[PDB]
Point group: C2
Chain length 54, copies 2
């Protein structure tokens, strides 16, 4: 009884995960193709606690 | 004089190409992410010369 109760929760969790990670895959192949930058990281100048943070 | 003349056609051909392999690359990651199927190849039963071809 514990075994079928758990298993049936388990099937939904790994189906949920298969959908979840396949969407991540659809965004990553999309990032790589369209938004993948070649330049170095760039610091960001802003206002902050007792003057500007960078 | 031959060098610089040829070099102008040479660069344009590889600018043309540099686009070219970017289009193949651009379709191939669209194909790979979204339409890439795991089922086995299936023949096509279509009429040909002499009767049915598959």
């Amino acid at each position: 009884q514990y075994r079928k109760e758990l298993g049936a929760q388990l099937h939904q969790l790994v189906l949920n995960s298969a959908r979840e990670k396949r969407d991540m895959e659809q965004r990553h192949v999309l990032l790589k193709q369209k938004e993948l930058g070649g330049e170095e990281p760039e610091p960001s100048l802003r206002e902050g606690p007792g003057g500007l943070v960078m």
